[PDB]
Structures are given as structure tokens and as C-alpha cells.
Amino acid sequence: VNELNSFHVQAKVINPNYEEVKVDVKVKFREGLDVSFYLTKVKEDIKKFL
């Protein structure tokens, strides 16, 4: 990038240094089963989406 910018400009390249909030919620009104659709499974799906 610095080769293509301008004689006068240098850019810096960094890592995002991530930081983030997380969800909690009211229990689902339905589930396939206590195990098959355990709250833990829902948590895993939520984690994947994020």
C-alpha cells in the first residue's frame, strides 16, 4: 500500500485487538428435548453465529 498512496503518506497495519459483549436470555418456550436442544446447544449455536 505505501508504494501506491502518495509521496507524502505512510499507512500503518494493525490487528483489531478484539473486545466484546455477550448475550443472556429468557429460557426458550420450546425445545426439541432437554438434551437434543439443550440450552447448551443453543449457546453453541449462538457462539457460532457470533
Binding site: 439443550y38 440450552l39 447448551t40
Partner: protein, 100 residues
């Protein structure tokens, strides 16, 4: 823990079915309240003893299978297939010693 029970088809011991679980980490073979050498699992109830059905047996390593409808005569569908009529796979060896 929540990830240790996979399924429970018999929650109140009224019908036949499958219970499936993983052996938990920290399960212990060396104990004194029950004989050593076995992993031990407990089931419990606080109700009168007859609110559940009587048992015939408990078996490990159970597998379910279903009849394939092909161009033949399903004579065995009038009355259930007798017990102990099935002993082997189509391909006899797949690293399995016996099927009951």
C-alpha cells in the same frame, strides 16, 4: 452435566427404550461404598414402589433395525418375528464377534 446425557427415552420407567450417556471425566473405579472395579451409576425415586413398571432386563450395546420391504411375502408381519431368529450380518465379518 448437560453435555453428558445424550438421550433418555424412559424418563418415568413406564415404557421400554434407550438411555444413552457418556462416561464422565473423574468417574472413579476405586471406591469403598460400593465394590471396586466398576463404574457406578445411580437412579432414584421418592414415590411408592409400584408407580413404575417391572423390568425384564438391562442390556448394553443395543442397536435398532427395521424391515426392508422388497418383492417377497411378509408372512412374519402377522405375528412378530420370533426371538433369536437373527444371528448375522449380510457380510459375515466386520470386526464383530456376535449378534443377539
Amino acid at each position: 452435566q448437560s453435555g453428558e446425557i445424550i438421550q433418555n427415552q424412559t424418563p418415568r420407567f413406564l415404557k421400554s427404550g434407550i438411555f444413552q450417556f457418556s462416561i464422565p471425566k473423574q468417574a472413579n473405579l476405586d471406591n469403598t461404598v460400593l465394590p471396586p472395579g466398576y463404574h457406578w451409576i445411580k437412579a432414584s425415586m421418592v414415590k411408592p414402589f409400584d408407580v413404575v413398571s417391572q423390568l425384564i432386563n438391562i442390556h448394553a450395546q443395543a442397536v435398532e433395525a427395521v424391515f426392508e420391504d422388497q418383492g417377497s411375502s411378509g408372512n412374519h408381519l402377522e405375528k412378530g418375528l420370533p426371538a433369536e431368529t437373527i444371528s448375522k450380518l449380510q457380510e459375515r465379518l466386520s470386526w464383530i464377534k456376535s449378534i443377539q
